[PDB]
A paper describes a structure:
The ribonuclease (RNase) H family of enzymes catalyze the specific cleavage of RNA strands of RNA/DNA hybrid duplexes and play an important role in DNA replication and repair. RNase H cleaves the phosphodiester bonds of RNA in double-stranded DNA/RNA hybrids, leaving 3′-hydroxyl and 5′-phosphate groups at each cleaved site. This catalysis requires divalent cations such as Mg2+, Mn2+ and Zn2+. Structural analyses found that the DEDD motif coordinates the divalent cation at the active site, acting as metal ligands, and constitutes the pivotal scaffold for the catalytic reaction. In addition to the highly conserved DEDD motif, a histidine adjacent to the active site (His124 in E. coli RNase HI) in the loop structure between β5 and α5 has also frequently been discussed.
In the RNase HI–Mg2+ complex structure. we for the first time observed two Mg2+ ions in the catalytic site in a substrate-unbound state. Hereafter, we describe chain A of RNH_Mg_3 in detail as a representative, because it is best ordered in the crystal. In the RNH_Mg_3 data set, two Mg2+ ions, designated metals A and B, were observed in the vicinity of the active site, and both metals adopted a nearly ideal octahedral coordination with the surrounding acidic amino-acid residues and water molecules. Metal B was coordinated by four water molecules and the carbonyl groups of Asp10 and Glu48, while metal A was coordinated by three water molecules and the carbonyl groups of Asp10, Asp134 and Gly11. The distances between metal B and its coordination ligands were in the range 2.0–2.2 Å, whereas those of metal A ranged from 2.4 to 3.5 Å. A tightly bound metal B could be vital for precise binding to the phosphoryl group of a substrate. Conversely, loose interactions of metal A, which are reported to be pivotal to the nucleophilic attack of the coordinated water molecule, seem to correspond to mobility, which possibly benefits product release and the recruitment of a new Mg2+ ion. H2Oδ− made relatively strong interactions with Mg2+ at the B position and Asp70, with O–X distances of 2.20 and 2.61 Å, respectively, while the O–N distance of 3.45 Å between the imidazole group of His124 and H2Oδ− suggests a weaker hydrogen bond. These detailed views are in good agreement with a scenario involving a His124→H2O→Mg2+→H2O→PO4 carboxylate–hydroxyl relay mechanism, as proposed by the previous NMR analyses.
Numbering used by the authors: 1 to 155
The structure:
Amino acid sequence: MLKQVEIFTDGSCLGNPGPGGYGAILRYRGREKTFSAGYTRTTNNRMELMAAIVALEALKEHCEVILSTDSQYVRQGITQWIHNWKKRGWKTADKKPVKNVDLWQRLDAALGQHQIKWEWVKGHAGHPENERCDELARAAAMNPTLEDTGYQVEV
Ligand SMILES: [Mg+2]
Ligand SMILES: [Mg+2]
């Protein structure tokens, strides 16, 4: 049997683009570990991906992971887009590079490490760990210390 683990994720961004941060909680046997960092210019959706990437990459063995997020962007990519990407070489139908391909490829690499069950929640109301992830992400966005070196500025 695989170790069973729970991960909760959220991103936060003060603009589009603007300062942003991610927040994640990894829970195993009651014990909780938190992850967060802040970036000077980024987007909310890139921070949503970073939260999942960082928490999954922390795992040192193959796990069964219950992954909970309210991000409709992450949900659309996981359930609607990534199957096209893997057939098309990570390009659009116009043979153009897909947006945020650097983070989507990193997330896909981390996801392939584990047995993943996704828990798509509707919001933060009633989900205390997801609310705490939002607090972690917002706190980092208010004290950014890194550059989002993979963000291709759109403006
Ligand atoms: Mg969010
Ligand atoms: Mg948020």
